[PDB]
C-alpha cells in the first residue's frame with residue numbers, strides 16, 4: 001500500500017521546463033507535504049530569470065502532480081488512486097485551455113526518489129495573444145478555491161479529472177482556464193480505481209521578503225469529498 005508512505009511529513013521537489021510562445025523558462029520548487037492534513041508548503045523559483053507568464057497560471061501545473069498529498073478521509077481511503085500508485089508513481093497529462101487565448105499542454109512524471117516525492121514536468125504553451133491576460137500579465141496574484149472532479153478511467157488503469165479555474169483579472173473580470181487531466185500508473189502493481197468524487201482545494205500565494213528572484217510561495221490544502 002502506497003498510503004503507508006504518507007503518514008508523516010514528506011519532502012517535495014518540483015522541476016518544470018516550459019516554452020510558451022517560444023519564451024523558454026524553468027522553475028524549481030522545494031517544500032513538504034503532510035497528507036494527514038492535506039497540507040502543502042512550497043516555494044518555487046524561476047531559475048532562468050523572469051517568468052514570462054503569471055505565476056497563478058502555473059499553480060495547477062506545479063501542484064497537481066502532488067495530489068498524492070490530498071487528505072482522503074478514512075471512510076473514502078479506498079478511493080485514493082494517487083497514493084496507491086506510489087512509490088513507482090504515475091504520469092499526469094493536462095490540457096489547459098485559456099478562454100479566448102492560448103493553451104498549455106503538460107506532462108509530468110510523479111514518483112518517489114528515495115524518501116522524496118518528485119514532480120518532473122514539461123509544459124508547452126501555444127497560440128497565446130501578445131497582450132492577452134496571460135502574456136500581458138493582467139492576472140492578479142491570488143488563487144480562488146475550487147474543486148477537482150475525479151472519475152475512473154478503467155481502460156488506462158488510471159483516473160481522469162476535469163475542472164475550471166477562474167483567474168482574477170486586475171480589472172475585476174475573470175480569465176477562465178478549462179482543465180482536462182489524465183493520470184496513468186508507471187508501475188505494474190494494482191492501484192485504487194475510485195468512484196466519482198472531488199478534491200476541494202484552497203490556495204494562498206505570497207512572496208518571501210528576502211527573495212530577489214522571481215518566485216512564488218504557496219500554501220495549499222487539498223481534501224477529498226463527494227462520497
Ligand SMILES: [Mg+2]
Nearest residue numbers: 193194195196
Ligand atoms: Mg461501487
